[PDB]
Amino acid sequence: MSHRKFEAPRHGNLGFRPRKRAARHQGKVKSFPKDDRTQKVHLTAFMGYKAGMTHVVRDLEKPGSKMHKKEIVEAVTIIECPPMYIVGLVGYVETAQGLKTYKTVWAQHLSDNFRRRLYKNWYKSKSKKAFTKYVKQYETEEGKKSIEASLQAIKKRCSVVRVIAHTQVHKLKLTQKKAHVLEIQVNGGSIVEKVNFAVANFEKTVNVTGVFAENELIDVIGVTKGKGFNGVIKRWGVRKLPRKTHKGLRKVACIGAWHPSRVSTTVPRAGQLGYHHRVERNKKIYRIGQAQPEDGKQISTGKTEFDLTEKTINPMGGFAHYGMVKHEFLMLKGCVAGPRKRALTLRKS
Amino acid sequence: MKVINSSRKVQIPENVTVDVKGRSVKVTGPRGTLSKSFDHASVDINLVGKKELTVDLWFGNRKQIACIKTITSIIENMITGVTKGYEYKMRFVYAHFPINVAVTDGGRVVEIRNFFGEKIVRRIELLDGITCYRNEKAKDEIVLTGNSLELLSQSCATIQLRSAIKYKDVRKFLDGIYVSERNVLESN
Amino acid sequence: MGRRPARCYRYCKNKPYIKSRYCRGVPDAKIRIFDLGRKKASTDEFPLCVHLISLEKEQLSSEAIEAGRISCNKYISKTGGKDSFHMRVRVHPWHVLRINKMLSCAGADRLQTGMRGAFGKPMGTVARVNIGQIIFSIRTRDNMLANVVEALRRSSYKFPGRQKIVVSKKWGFTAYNREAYQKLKADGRLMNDGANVKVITNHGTLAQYAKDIAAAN
RNA sequence: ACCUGCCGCUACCAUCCGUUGGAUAAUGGCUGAACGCCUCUAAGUCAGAAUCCAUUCUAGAAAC
RNA sequence: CGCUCAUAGCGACGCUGCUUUUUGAUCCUUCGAUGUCGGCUCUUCUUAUCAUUGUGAAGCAGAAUUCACAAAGUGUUGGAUUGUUCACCCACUAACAAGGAACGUGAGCUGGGUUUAGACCGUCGUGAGACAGGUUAGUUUUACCCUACUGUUGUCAAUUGUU
RNA sequence: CCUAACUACUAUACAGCGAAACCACUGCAAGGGGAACGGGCCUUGCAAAAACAGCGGGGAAAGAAGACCCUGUUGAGCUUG
């Protein structure tokens, strides 16, 4: 047969096709914006944590668009964004099949992130106690030399670099004795600068404000709401028998036909609809939220004009169950991937 | 079946220095210099003294022969041009809807503004080395001078292409910028 | 035959049928005419003859032939006129084509459409020609050669396959070359016949003869 | 049974989000022969598709 | 013919192909049983491109239309009636182009036709009965095997370091 | 239209308890030729233990020596001038 309809537009997209349980529990992307910026001011990525949604009335910004100064409501995804603690500098060098781990360098002041990935690990256990056997930086004076050696070499030898950062989730509402590690590739200026200043920053702690300005779009990442295995119906948006007289199923009819005389990838089937990656882009960012030292609350109201009160963005009752903002946060444009209490990640556009 | 190819000789005036490093020309005259690449077809190319370059290749075909003829011709033009600069003048045609032609003198960029109703800004960056200037002939004409004939002409053509109406009749408008006075030189 | 596509018959095969007391049910030939231009033209004025030949051995349909003749009969007029073309074609269609009809079927069959009683009924009259065998032939004046070759050329399109055009070396519709034609006039052996030449020749089919020179002279 | 009904799932029965570079085809030109002129072509080159391939996104190899 | 003007657009009589989306012809395959027709579902592919992207012709002034290249990247509708593809109307749309996949798609459905028995008519038959005639009612079984797909563990049932 | 949610129950995991039909051998594909639609032949694409739960494209799946149709000097039930 012709078909004979036309439409059948591929229910779904083959650009998310493997649609399996994603690799990283956190938001993760294997891609970055390229080099045309200043230096450490442009860190590129950041890591936040979701904590629900509210709505915000503002005015439009478009002429000829139901007034450029008329009010419209919109939702927003508010997201507790604790400041991060960079700790490794890591040097990639560009080679005949992409980039590789030449060699990292790590800060001497801290090595508790290492430890944090340990209590939750091992099974025979020779080196839980506190030690190592995938090679990590200890020592005051002798290791210093090694660090120095590393630093120069990476700086000289090719290609760009990133910083092993991580979150401070202990101080977050949700308790976790492991924290989330991340790369924030550094763009702009020159390699010498880039390599150098990472070392300086180890002790220092970056802020979401450090990365983004209040009117900047986002390359948002996360891991989608883990619904679990479910059949071809709302996994691909198919159809059914609405007047209903069928002894088969909710599940679809032909799966390929006697056509290539086997069944194809390109057929919607019973699998799972949750932890997947993806990336949504161009999110306006409406307001960077301030830190709260357990005294003031005007800081999480925003303005006092038009706001016309003093309150946290947190609701009347607040969050006793869910992720409660006590920290820096972010008002985006509405909707981000991932459930209400998830480890997102952010990139600039 | 396979026939020998005659050499094609060209006299060079004493204004210029044709050097030829490994079958690849550079011709330095008053207006400046033009290089160019050859040995496409494996041809030989020699200097006798310094008033005679000659191209040849002593076996081959019609195909090869043609190529020999071409290369020589190309170099002759270059020789002419780098000593006496080439001039391709393009006149434009509209005064029913009047036309607005503009010129960035610094970067050597023509910018055509309003023709056939358009409100757009059509900016065409000229090719390497060549230039243009606005000239009062009859409240008309952009004059494009340059020493690489190949390049200047190409640039002009590009401009011509860009200044026409790509939807609906080709004779409702005859309008746009087109070439007028070409193969023109100067010694003033 | 205009019903069929003529791919069906453009290969000379099957021993050749005819009109007769045996094949009665034939249609009438498409061309029943072999007369293009001035037939009442003398042999001593149109000294050129051009010929068209089938390059390929094949059948040659009556309809096709007919079509061809009006590439040499519209084109008779635009170039020269009636006082140049004298054509006898030089092929006819004696041969017939049969058609075992199964057109009956347009939805189902009666089974008589099948190969029982297969033998087809007469439908399509056609010619058979080798490669030499000549198919058009214009006897003409020798100021008309390119304005008659293009008639032939035109005709060639309307024949299947490859078709060669030519000019002979004779006065056309004669055995005798242009070299041996002047002999006839000179030696007093030219005998006119309004179209043909008989050509006077001494011989003996009698008892004691002398009128064999004095007959036509 | 009925009304109301958070949390939770879910609706064009709601809300948000869907990029930029090269390479070309056709085709339109350039310089320019073979073919003293000529010609987009032969040598050569320019512009140029919802096209191609990258960037993006998914997955992540008995690959590091 | 297209005023005029063979090829803008068509194109006679005539001639050559391709196609397998028509139907025949054939009877190789299957009667140790490939479940026959349509509709729904769903993908895939083809291009002989209806729309759109970019181009070039036009009897292309504009408008709209027509013709053609590249190109199958994205679209390709809602309904009455019909068992029905086919058919024919109403309505939208940029457009509602033709096709293929065992006349795609029955352990995916439905059974509206076609397919048995019961039965009504009409024509035919002395009659039992017949009908590519009409009418009506008529049980659609099985995946707990291998593969293929979807997701889900786990592994070089160690490649000769753990983690 | 356009699907949604919810509960029961089965399924799904365990614990006991345990089954058949089927089964030449066997299970990756494209193309080729070949009882003309190959899993095996040929040439290419390739290839990675053991498995789970779904799904129904393939095994010209299974159930039935098709009774549709023809044949056999095979029958029967009925009809008639």
Add this chain to the structure above:
RNA sequence: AUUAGCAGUUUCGGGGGCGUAAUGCUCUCAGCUGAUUCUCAAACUCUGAACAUUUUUGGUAAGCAGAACUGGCGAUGUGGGUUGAACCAAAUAUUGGGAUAAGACGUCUAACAUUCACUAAUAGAUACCACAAAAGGUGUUAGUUCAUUAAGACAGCAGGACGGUGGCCAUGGAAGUCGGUAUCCGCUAAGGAGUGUGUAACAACUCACCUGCCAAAUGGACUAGCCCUGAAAAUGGAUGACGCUAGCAGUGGAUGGUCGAUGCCCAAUCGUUAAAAGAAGUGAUAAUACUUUUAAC
């Protein structure tokens, strides 16, 4: 079966022109006759031929159906054609070596060099065989014929391109060129009562036509190799694959050379057959229902 005109007829057929009209002549057209012309007539023939290949009937055809002769396949395989019942070589006891057949020889895959061309194509790559045609190409190669050329060519650029004359007509404008018909002569180096563009039609410009210069080849109509266009369809795909290209490993040749079957040669071993022999290496045995020799398979 059937085409053409010609002649000789016309008290025989018909209608015209010539005295009114005919057949009285002369015409186109009827009939008859005579000589010539077209295609010759499976069931005509004076004459008369030596599954595959060849012949051949039906059939548009069919991997359809039906015959003939030979060959195979089928009741024999092997090598070769990628693969394959039938095509090629060539037939199989079991082996050894040697040399071949068809087919190959860049690599897969045993097997090579040398030489001349041709093709530049998303190609082109061994019968059967996995299709391609009519018709096009100022693609390149190779030819063939006629024309032109130092009396100066060809292309190029430059000059000239007239008088009668506004040719007669239509018009009262169409003055070469909306357009009909004649289409001549002068003079010249040459110039159509004109090839278009243009214009009210002209004017103006250009073309045929000629000459200035430059300076050696030019022009054309065809044939025919390879290539291209023609040349569109359904999972992802086929010289078998890779791949190849400016000698190629493609095509068409040339001169050698090599690989290679269960074929052939030679040797061996076993059986079969035919012939012969007997103390069977059974030279003290005493075997013939058995063993041996020779030859062929």
